[PDB]
Structure formats: structure tokens, C-alpha cells
Design an enzyme around this catalytic site. Structure first.
Site, PDB file in Angstrom:
ATOM      1  N   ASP A   1      -5.071  -9.799  -8.098  1.00 41.57           N
ATOM      2  CA  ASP A   1      -5.276  -8.975  -9.292  1.00 41.57           C
ATOM      3  C   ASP A   1      -4.033  -8.296  -9.872  1.00 41.57           C
ATOM      4  O   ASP A   1      -3.686  -8.523 -11.032  1.00 41.57           O
ATOM      5  CB  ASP A   1      -6.367  -7.922  -9.048  1.00 41.57           C
TER       6      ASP A   1
ATOM      7  N   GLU B   1     -11.501   1.073 -11.208  1.00 43.28           N
ATOM      8  CA  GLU B   1     -11.364  -0.024 -12.161  1.00 43.28           C
ATOM      9  C   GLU B   1     -12.096   0.061 -13.489  1.00 43.28           C
ATOM     10  O   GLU B   1     -11.507  -0.248 -14.525  1.00 43.28           O
ATOM     11  CB  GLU B   1     -11.652  -1.366 -11.477  1.00 43.28           C
TER      12      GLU B   1
ATOM     13  N   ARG C   1       1.191   3.909  -3.486  1.00 38.26           N
ATOM     14  CA  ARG C   1       0.679   5.260  -3.308  1.00 38.26           C
ATOM     15  C   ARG C   1       1.750   6.307  -3.009  1.00 38.26           C
ATOM     16  O   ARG C   1       1.855   7.315  -3.709  1.00 38.26           O
ATOM     17  CB  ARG C   1      -0.373   5.284  -2.191  1.00 38.26           C
TER      18      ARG C   1
ATOM     19  N   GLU D   1       0.793  -1.221   0.000  1.00 37.83           N
ATOM     20  CA  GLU D   1       0.000   0.000   0.000  1.00 37.83           C
ATOM     21  C   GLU D   1       0.832   1.281   0.000  1.00 37.83           C
ATOM     22  O   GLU D   1       0.514   2.236  -0.708  1.00 37.83           O
ATOM     23  CB  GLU D   1      -0.950   0.024   1.202  1.00 37.83           C
TER      24      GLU D   1
HETATM   25 CA   LIG Z   1      -5.062  -1.027  -9.097  1.00 38.38          CA
END
Ligand SMILES: [Ca+2]
EC number: 3.2.1.113
Length: 456
Positions: free
Chosen positions: A222, A358, A95, A91
Site C-alpha cells: 500500500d 484509512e 512513527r 515501523e
Molecule cells: Ca498509512
């Protein structure tokens, strides 16, 4: 309250939304991780100005230089990594490190690179494990890393490569790239996959996959697939093993997770648990048509394009079949041929929408690759839904609990950093008619929509 005359109306609209959102951040959460729009408050996750950093490149790209300079000053004076706080390696990397790297590239301001190198060094303690597969958390101040409150999640350790590779490239310090590439290489030869599909967890001591037999393309996996292709692109398409693993994986999705709903035959991706298929598709999976299209642009099989177009339509439907026009967190499709039965079904527990990017993310890639303006039209419709059902009068936008009740969407009182870092950035780029604006040929976006240069 005025914007550049040269902007087409849709990008102009995105800017108006960003400004209304930023208005809230500045007034009630300046310097804080996330804004609580409804209660005019704020929340802290890492205490590193998350929303601000995540929005740095978005502000620049949108031409909000005044706002950018102001945010820049905050980074220059208030951003300190000498803090006793535990952060999630993945994370914080996508970011903070990713956001700082993009800010540096777009502005040319060395401040952002200096912060990036600082942050990168504080993250390294996470790789000190027997297998070299990194721990999930690391305290940036004390220098101690450790597992979740367990093993690490596969997507997390394989979705930090773009950022670490670029930091090594810019600083000349090879430790970042080497640590991250070791993980990628280890994963490449690890057994326990199902035709390219990877399990959700991996033990940092044994370095082996755990929770075997269970596969999904949603959370915990993903971005693994996303970064196989993006790393290959980033490296100038020379690292064949990455391409091979990606191509194999897409075939694995086809053979094991791809199905069609009834009666409309919407192509969707489900989950597999020990041989049992589950017609459950998290909205997170909508990143796929975009990644598929991106690959096609770079020379991947035309079959990937067909799949991309089909999944884009499904993702679009997941949004449009809801009363608010916004897709719920998770969607269950029907395989059971039954006359009066529709295709989309949503459990009351999964009716929330956290302002996820998304769908608009994939619309951007589908448009850039096909040039079909319907994808821009679809994005404009989704933006309208965000404005109508998530807008907070005093400023900002909020995630909502009920995507099926236009009269009472139920704001959760929270604006995720990715709304400004990802959702509005992809929409702005989608509405651009200039293929040279952050061209698929010159830049590759990390998983938090922070563009990074393609190596030459
Ligand atoms: Ca993403």
C-alpha cells in the site's frame, strides 16, 4: 474540563475524545508503547514511548499545549535509544522518526530534532546489504541489522523516504537521503512488476522482487504507491520518474485490480494472484481515495478524481454497512449477479476493527479537494461509532473483535498508537474549514499522519 471557544463543535468533539483517550494513557501507560485500556495496563513493542511520540504532533495541532509540554519533558528525560532492542526499520521510521520530525517542525523545539538525528543514525546499519536494499530489522543499540524471524517487504523499504530525505535536509548529513533514494532508484528499474504494480517482497542479497505474480494494494505494498506521489510532492514536483511510476501504477490498478460489486456496482480494489482475481479488499486499501484526491489537487488527471470519489463511497459503505458503523479489517465484495445478494460480505475472522484511520484519512483529502461537506458528515458519523462502541470508561479506547455486534463488540484491550497519531488527527483536520491549516500546498503527511514541509 473546558476547551477553546473558537472551535467548531466537531473539532471540539475530537478534542474531547483525545482527552478521554489520553486520560487512559497518562494513568495506566505513561512512557510505555501502548495502552491496554480495559485491563488498565500497557504493552511494550519497542520500549520507546511509541504512543507518546506518535501523539506529539496531534496534541500540538489540537492545542493541547499543557499535555504537549508534559510529553515533551518525558522525551527530554526518559527517551533513550541506548537500548538493546530490535526494531522494524519501517515501523520505527514512520512513527518515531516521522513523529519527532513533525514535533520539531510544529513546536520549533530542537530537542525533537536532536532525538531524530540520533535515531536516524542508529537505523543506518539496516542498509548494509549486498543490494543496498535494507534489512527489515535493526538493533538500535548493538548496531546489527537482520532479516525477519526471508526477504524484506516492498512497502517497508519504499515507505521510509519522506522521513530520511527530510532528516538529511534538516541536518545537512546526506547519508540518510542517499541511502533511501538508492532504494527508490533500484525499485524504479526493477523488472517483475505488472503495469506499475509491485510484488510484496524483495531479496536483500539479490535485490530482486520475490513472490512474483502476486499483487495487492493492502499490507506489504500500500504505502509504496502512496510514497511515489508524496515524494514527488515533497521534492517540489521535480522528480518526474516518481510521478511517472505513480501514474503508471494507478493505470495498473484500473486494468488489474479494479472491479464493481453487484447489484449496487460499488467500485472496489481486489487482489491478483497468478492471474486469478480475488474480490478481497483490506481496509488498509482505503488510503487510496485520499492519495488519489491528493494527486488530483497537484495536477494529476481528472480520472483519478472520479476513481477517488467512487472508492471513498465504497470505503464509507464498508463502515456504514456494519452494525457498529465501523469497517471490519477485510471486506469481500460480490461480482456474482444474484437478486437477493447484497454487495458487502465479511468473514467471521475479519470482523475486528483496530481503530484504523484509512477512511477518515481519505475523507480529509476528499474534503480538502472537493469542499463537499458530506465528507465531514461521514467522518462525524464514524467518530460517533468510535465513541459508542470502543470507549473505555476508565479512559482510552480499544480495538474490538466484532464490528457486527453492537451489543457485544468485544474489546481487545488495546489502543494502537495510530489511533491518536492518525485517526484523531485526520478527523480534527477534516472538521477544519480552514484550507490553510496544514495546507496540501505546504505540507505532505507521512504514512503515520506526521506532516512534513514541502520543499521550495
Ligand atoms: Ca498509512
Amino acid at each position: 474540563a473546558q476547551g477553546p471557544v473558537h472551535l467548531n463543535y466537531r473539532q471540539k468533539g475530537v478534542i474531547d475524545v483525545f482527552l478521554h483517550a489520553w486520560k487512559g494513557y497518562r494513568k495506566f501507560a505513561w512512557g510505555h508503547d501502548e495502552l491496554k485500556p480495559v485491563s488498565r495496563s500497557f504493552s511494550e513493542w519497542f520500549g520507546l514511548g511509541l504512543t507518546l511520540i506518535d501523539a506529539l504532533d496531534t496534541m500540538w495541532i489540537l492545542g493541547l499545549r499543557k499535555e504537549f509540554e508534559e510529553a515533551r519533558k518525558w522525551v527530554s528525560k526518559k527517551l533513550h535509544f541506548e537500548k538493546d532492542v530490535d526494531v522494524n526499520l519501517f515501523e520505527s521510521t514512520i512513527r518515531i522518526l516521522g513523529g519527532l520530525l513533525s514535533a520539531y517542525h510544529l513546536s520549533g523545539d530542537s530537542l525533537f530534532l536532536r532525538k531524530a538525528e540520533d535515531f536516524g543514525n542508529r537505523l543506518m546499519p539496516a542498509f548494509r546489504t549486498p543490494s543496498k536494499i535494507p534489512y527489515s530489522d535493526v538493533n538500535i543499540g548493538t548496531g546489527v541489522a537482520h532479516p525477519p524471524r526471508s526477504d524484506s517487504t516492498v512497502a517497508e523499504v519504499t515507505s521510509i523516504q519522506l522521513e530520511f530525505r527530510e532528516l538529511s535536509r534538516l541536518t545537512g548529513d546526506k547519508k540518510f537521503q542517499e541511502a533511501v533514494e538508492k532504494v527508490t532508484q533500484h525499485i524504479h528499474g526493477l523488472s517483475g512488476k505488472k503495469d506499475g504494480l509491485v510484488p510484496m517482497f524483495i531479496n536483500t542479497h539479490s535485490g530482486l522482487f520475490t513472490h512474483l505474480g502476486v499483487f495487492t494494494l493492502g499490507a506489504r505494498a500500500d504505502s509504496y504507491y502512496e510514497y511515489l506521489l508524496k515524494q514527488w510532492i515533497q521534492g517540489g514536483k521535480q522528480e518526474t520518474q516518481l510521478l511517472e511510476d505513480y501514474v503508471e501504477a494507478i493505470e495498473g490498478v484500473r486494468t488489474h485490480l479494479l472491479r464493481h460489486s453487484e447489484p449496487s456496482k460499488l467500485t472496489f480494489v481486489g487482489e491478483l494472484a497468478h492471474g486469478r482475481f480475488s474480490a478481497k479488499m483490506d481496509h488498509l486499501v482505503c488510503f487510496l481515495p485520499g492519495t488519489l484526491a491528493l494527486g488530483v489537487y497537484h495536477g494529476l488527471p481528472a480520472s483519478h478524481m472520479e476513481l477517488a470519489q467512487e472508492l471513498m463511497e465504497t470505503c464509507y459503505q464498508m463502515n456504514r454497512q456494519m452494525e457498529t458503523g465501523l469497517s471490519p479489517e477485510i471486506v469481500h465484495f460480490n461480482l456474482y449477479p444474484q437478486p437477493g445478494r447484497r454487495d458487502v460480505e465479511v468473514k467471521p475472522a475479519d470482523r475486528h476493527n483496530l481503530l484504523r484511520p484509512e477512511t477518515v484519512e481519505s475523507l480529509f483529502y476528499l474534503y480538502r479537494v472537493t469542499g463537499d461537506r458530506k465528507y465531514q458528515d461521514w467522518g462525524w458519523e464514524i467518530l460517533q461509532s468510535f465513541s459508542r462502541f470502543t470507549r473505555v470508561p476508565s479512559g482510552g479506547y480499544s480495538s474490538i473483535n466484532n464490528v457486527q455486534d453492537p451489543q457485544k463488540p468485544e474489546p481487545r484491550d488495546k489502543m494502537e498508537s495510530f489511533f491518536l497519531g492518525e485517526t484523531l488527527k485526520y478527523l480534527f483536520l477534516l472538521f477544519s474549514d480552514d484550507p490553510n491549516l496544514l495546507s496540501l500546498d505546504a505540507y505532505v503527511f507521512n504514512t503515520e499522519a506526521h506532516p512534513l514541509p514541502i520543499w521550495t
